[PDB]
Amino acid sequence: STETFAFNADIRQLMSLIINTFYSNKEIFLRELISNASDALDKIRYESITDTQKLSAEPEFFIRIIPDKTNNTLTIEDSGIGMTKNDLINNLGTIARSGTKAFMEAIQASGDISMIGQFGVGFYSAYLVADHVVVISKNNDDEQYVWESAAGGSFTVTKDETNEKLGRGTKIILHLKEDQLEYLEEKRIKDLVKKHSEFISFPIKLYCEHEWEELN
Numbered sequence: 001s002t003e004t005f006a007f008n009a010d011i012r013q014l015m016s017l018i019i020n021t022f023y024s025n026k027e028i029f030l031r032e033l034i035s036n037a038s039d040a041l042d043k044i045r046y047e048s049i050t051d052t053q054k055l056s057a058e059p060e061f062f063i064r065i066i067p068d069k070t071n072n073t074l075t076i077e078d079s080g081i082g083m084t085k086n087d088l089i090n091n092l093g094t095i096a097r098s099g100t101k102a103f104m105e106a107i108q109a110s111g112d113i114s115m116i117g118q119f120g121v122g123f124y125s126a127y128l129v130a131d132h133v134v135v136i137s138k139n140n141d142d143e144q145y146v147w148e149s150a151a152g153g154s155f156t157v158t159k160d161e162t163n164e165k166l167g168r169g170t171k172i173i174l175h176l177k178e179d180q181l182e183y184l185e186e187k188r189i190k191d192l193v194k195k196h197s198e199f200i201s202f203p204i205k206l207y208c209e210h211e212w213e214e215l216n
């Protein structure tokens, strides 16, 4: 059954800024999410080098990008370390980190919205292009859970019993805004990924039409 959580106030203000901004460089969400996937993969590769068993639920490292024109969603999937239920609650809303508070104080003092691009807003950049965001995650030390938020001051976390099992990793599902459908186009995606992927040392694949295309 679903549990509801309140966004930390600072995180709520960050989301508020993101949702109301006219910042035109929205495409940066893609680099933020792919970097997150790379970091999560970093972690499971690191943990498993001295302990190969940690790879058993999913032996291959990958990042997959799946645009879906039928329901206007863009999905970023990885087989990284994944998040436990507590991880989703702790890392995706309830706790405002040092950097986040510093970013908010800085941007409020300067009003310089180019900071969004210069310093980044991490995972929350998804709300630059999406109305609603879903996160399915599976970590070795817990069952599969689902995090959801339409950015209304709250999010929910629900033990997953409807979706296909990931084995290990994370699936970020962006429900794109009506005016942001360009990010379903494969050329748009490839050009963005090419721009930010030189030093991502995991295989990146794009779902095309259907077949998987290698981006690196």
Ligand SMILES: Nc1ncnc2c1ncn2[C@@H]1O[C@H](COP(=O)(O)OP(=O)(O)O)[C@@H](O)[C@H]1O
Pocket: 036, 037, 040, 078, 080, 081, 082, 083, 091, 092, 121, 122, 123, 124, 169, 170
């Ligand atoms: N794809 C992912 N797999 C596993 N954990 C993730 C993923 N994306 C985000 N997280 C967790 O959410 C946290 C917050 O993400 P973010 O706001 O991008 O900050 P940062 O990238 O600086 O960690 C990350 O530190 C990470 O712990």
